Structure 1
Amino acid sequence: NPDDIVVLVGRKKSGKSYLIKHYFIPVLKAHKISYIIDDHNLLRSGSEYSKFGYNATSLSDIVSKQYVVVYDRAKNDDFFEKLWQASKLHSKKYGTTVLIIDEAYYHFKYKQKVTPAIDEALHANRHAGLGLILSTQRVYDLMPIVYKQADLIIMFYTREPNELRWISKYISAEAAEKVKTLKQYHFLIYDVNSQTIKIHKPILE
């Protein structure tokens, strides 16, 4: 489902962005589904996702360009609110769109303020015609309501006790047990709605 909320959790170099770049993005593009990437990581030239769409420099670009990448310099509440409004208008034009947010702790941080945009993103995304892919490094980086509102939660290896406790409490105790034994680039997929778990082999490319 293009309007699903998907959350990816994995340590640095776990393979979560690789999953976005070589599974999610290709599948979206294959089904002719548009996306907007909120990118926080600068590279030597450009940003991490520069190759994956039009590098926007105005709000107008966000609405008009079918595949769009937004480098987020301010990384604040005001920016996400503006991006969300522009994403909704983008969705009006291009139909159901996935908003991809790497390093999502900038906008959905544990104990941060829930703006109107955040509340809408997590509760009214389908009506807004927007799916979400949210990515973070530790489970406890984000507001627990993100996991309660997700449709799919993807997790790579961890045995960190606070992480396991969060997973047990807000996601699934079965997930908390199974995440401990994942090998490199293997991942667990928890379906929040069916309460089902599948272990996935590393993706090819």
Structure 2
Amino acid sequence: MNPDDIVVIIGRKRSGKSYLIKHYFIPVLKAHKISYIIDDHNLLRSGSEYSKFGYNVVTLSDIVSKQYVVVYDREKNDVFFEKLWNGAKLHAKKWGTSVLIIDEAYYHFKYRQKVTPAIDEALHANRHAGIGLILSTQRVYDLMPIVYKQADLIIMFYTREPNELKWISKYISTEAAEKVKTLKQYYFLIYDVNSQMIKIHKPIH
């Protein structure tokens, strides 16, 4: 197992996307002892919804000891992402290939005129860093078109919005836009960017 590819997952709240990430992707990585870092921006006072999947790294001991990491991003900042990314590259030096999971990728990967060096590395040199990416977002146009060009896999849950379908067809795949509107609840469509193939998946157990 060497997960250094880029997966984008698109789905609204309650689409079932959270279950796919938290009850499939993260547990599979843990099971195969693949390290990961989760970037979470959801300030709940009960704390991160990802707290059971990893540790908040604070001390020197944490730095060398904690393979599964949760980061609370209060900043949602380009300054923050450079630290997160530079940190992840070193995390992979320590633990081997690692996966950076971004819970609401809009904050870092939304449209910007001047794309920061780290974001550029994330999208164009991720396999050199040994960092796979899972970018989660609610709506397809939340993210720069370049993200979908650079992705290996694009996972989509049902959407009705005409704005979304036309965006999908324009920037990703017309066939995907056609089949996404046919998805039953919790079903998800997977577009493989490298094979140009679309598969519909049944809901996770």
Shorter-chain-normalised TM-score: which range?
Answer: over 0.9
Alignment check: 8 A CA contact 1:42 1:48 kept: no
**Which residue is 1:169 aligned to?**
170
State the TM-score, normalizing by the size of structure 1: 0.95
Q: Structure 2: how far apart are the matches of 1:189 and 1:148?
A: 15
Q: Percent identity?
A: 90
Alignment check: 8 A CA contact 1:56 1:68 kept: yes
Whether 1:135 and 2:136 are equivalent positions in the alignment is yes
**Which residue is 2:120 aligned to?**
119
Whether 1:49 and 2:50 are equivalent positions in the alignment is yes
Closer, same or farther in 2 for the Cα pair 1:178/1:74, shift >3 Å? same
Alignment check: 8 A CA contact 1:40 1:71 kept: yes
> What secondary structure, in the 3-state scheme, does the structure 1 residue paired with 2:159 have?
coil
Q: Structure 2: how far apart are the matches of 1:28 and 1:178?
A: 29
Runs (4 or more) in structure 1 with deviation over 3 Å come to 57-64
- Segments of 5+ residues of structure 2 without an aligned counterpart are none
Task: Report how many aligned residue pairs link the two structures.
Answer: 204
Whether 1:200 and 2:205 are equivalent positions in the alignment is no
Q: Structure 1: how far apart are the matches of 2:39 and 2:159?
A: 26
Q: How does 1:5-16 map to 2 (within 5 A)?
A: 5-16=6-17
Q: CA RMSD in A?
A: 1.6
Closer, same or farther in 2 for the Cα pair 1:188/1:120, shift >3 Å? same
- Segments of 5+ residues of structure 1 without an aligned counterpart are none
Alignment check: 8 A CA contact 1:57 1:70 kept: no
Residue 63 of structure 1 and its aligned partner are, at CA, apart by 6.3
Per-residue CA deviations over 1:47-99 (Å, capped at 9, x if unaligned) read: 11111111224698466520000000011100000110010000001000000
Residue 43 of structure 1 and its aligned partner are, at CA, apart by 2.4
State the TM-score, normalizing by the size of structure 2: 0.95
The aligned amino acid for 1:39 is: D
> What secondary structure, in the 3-state scheme, does the structure 2 residue paired with 1:114 have?
coil
**Which residue is 1:85 aligned to?**
86
